[PDB]
């Protein structure tokens, strides 16, 4: 089906120490494939997925130099922002960046991203048209002017529609055994009696890949959106995922409820009722 | 494959 590549960068200022902490990771869909950490001993890009290991020494030298420069940039970005917003130096601050591309089922470019947040709030982002920037405040407008003068969107488009996509296909075909697989959810239901008149029902979804899944509860065919308890989809640790959803149900009224699972791995959407 | 252009803020 559809696939995506993403890189995530986090840099955090450390007033109690000299250097900021910088962390970078790469994902293909929901599988991490590389990392870099400014405090690691190696000071190199490291592989995190079996199938990125078949890449040559030329790939590793290149990704390492590019990431170290990403690192230096974001170290300096910290200073620049602390300047823009007139903040002192004693307090820790976080810059986050993300960029990457998506491809359709035909493996052709669909969309691309390049966005930042500062201290958790959106700062600037590439727009869907891939030629414009969104800047939320006046500080970000300063960044937007620098970038327009240096034609960054046009250079980014070049990367997003060429390099990002080409690499993604390359990864998809080497990690075919991992990345192009489909694992359907293993599903079951559990009952718990909170008290004399009420009871929680949980709809379990296990061992599935990729992470996208949909769990909805129904009462008499109707969507029970509010009253449904939904946990964050969570990694099992072996490249599969787990999710559940629960509803507080009146004692003896259990069998009027239905759980509905949706997943790419699933030939037909399943409908679970308690027995 | 990372990008090789490094814009600043």
């Amino acid at each position, epitope marked *: 089906g559809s696939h995506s590549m993403r890189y995530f960068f986090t840099s955090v200022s450390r007033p109690g120490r000299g250097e900021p902490r910088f962390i970078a990771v790469g994902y293909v869909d929901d599988t991490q494939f590389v990392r870099f950490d400014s405090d690691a001993a190696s000071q190199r890009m490291e592989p995190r997925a079996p199938w990125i290991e078949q890449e040559g020494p030329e790939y590793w030298d*290149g990704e390492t*130099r*590019k990431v*170290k*420069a990403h690192s*230096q*940039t974001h170290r*300096v970005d910290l200073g620049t922002l602390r300047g823009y917003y007139n903040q002192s130096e004693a307090g820790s601050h976080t810059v986050q960046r993300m960029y990457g591309c998506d491809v359709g089922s035909d493996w052709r470019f669909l969309r691309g991203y390049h966005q930042y947040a500062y201290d958790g709030k959106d700062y600037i982002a590439l727009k869907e048209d891939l030629r414009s920037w969104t800047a939320a405040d006046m500080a970000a407008q300063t960044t937007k002017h620098k970038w327009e003068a*240096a*034609h960054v969107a*046009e*250079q980014l*488009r*070049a*990367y997003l*529609e*060429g*390099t990002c996509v080409e*690499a993604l296909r390359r990864y998809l075909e080497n990690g075919k055994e991992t990345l192009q697989r489909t694992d359907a959810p293993k599903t079951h239901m559990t009952h718990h009696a909170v008290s004399d008149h009420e009871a929680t029902l949980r709809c379990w979804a296990l061992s599935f890949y990729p992470a996208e899944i949909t769990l909805t509860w129904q009462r008499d065919g109707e969507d029970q959106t509010q009253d449904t308890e939904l946990v964050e989809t969570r990694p099992a640790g072996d490249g599969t995922f787990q999710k559940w959803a629960a509803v507080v149900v009146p004692s003896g009224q259990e069998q009027r409820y239905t759980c509905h699972v949706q997943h790419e791995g699933l030939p037909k959407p399943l409908t679970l009722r308690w027995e | *494959a990372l*990008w*090789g*252009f*490094f*814009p*600043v803020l």
Partner: T-cell receptor, first 114, second 113 residues
């Protein structure tokens, strides 16, 4: 692959006639090109950028248009003048997959005569 | 402004001697580059640096070493000069907008038997 090909050698042009220096390239990814100039016994410096809309970034002075279809970035001017005599470099900028670097051509010497 | 300086401006060296070209730059640029100029080869990158205390190999690093002791200074080093290395050498610098590089005046080196 990822190269630059310029007009080979010395170009001799009579003042007041149109300059026309050839650059063609080969690029894997979307092309960004730059003309540098070196006057005799001077530092090379940036002359022009391939950015702009379509392929026209400068009028009376030097200008160039990028044609992606035939991979051309020819340097042009309407009326050469003696002060234009210099060495001109065509450069490809690679910053998509590889770390930002300029890939220069062999340069073309322009000699404008009275 | 953006003014790069190089020294020496000229040098006559013997084959197998140690040669050190120096660059200095006060433009607050993190990026520096060393090129060499020849006939029918133009400007070929030898070494570059994106931050103080690190160097990367360029298109033609062989026979050359590089040093970035600080943001301002960037050295090109020939340990055993050879006739092939007779050329004009250029040092350049830029900020993040790295396709706009500012060049030093240049250094003419000649190597002799």
């Amino acid at each position: 692959m990822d190269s630059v090909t310029q007009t080979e050698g010395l170009v001799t042009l009579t003042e007041g006639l149109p300059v026309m220096l050839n650059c063609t390239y080969q690029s894997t990814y979307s092309p960004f090109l730059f003309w540098y100039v070196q006057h005799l016994n001077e530092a090379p410096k940036l002359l022009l950028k391939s950015f702009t809309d379509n392929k026209r970034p400068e009028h009376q002075g030097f200008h160039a248009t990028l044609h992606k279809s035939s991979s051309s970035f020819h340097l042009q001017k309407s009326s050469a003048q003696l002060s234009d005599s210099a060495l001109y470099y065509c450069a490809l900028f690679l910053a998509s997959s590889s770390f930002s670097k300029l890939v220069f051509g062999q340069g073309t010497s322009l000699s404008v005569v009275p | 402004e953006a003014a790069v300086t190089q020294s020496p401006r000229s040098k006559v060296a013997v084959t197998g001697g140690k040669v050190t070209l120096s660059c200095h730059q006060t433009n607050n640029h993190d990026y520096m580059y060393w090129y060499r100029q020849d006939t029918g080869h133009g400007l070929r990158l030898i070494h570059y640096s994106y931050v103080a205390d690190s160097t990367e190999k360029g298109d033609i690093p062989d026979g050359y070493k590089a040093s970035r002791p600080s943001q301002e200074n960037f050295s090109l080093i020939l340990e055993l000069a050879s006739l092939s290395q007779t050329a004009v050498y250029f040092c350049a610098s830029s900020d993040w907008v790295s396709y706009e590089q500012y060049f030093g005046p240049g250094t003419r080196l000649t190597v002799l038997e």
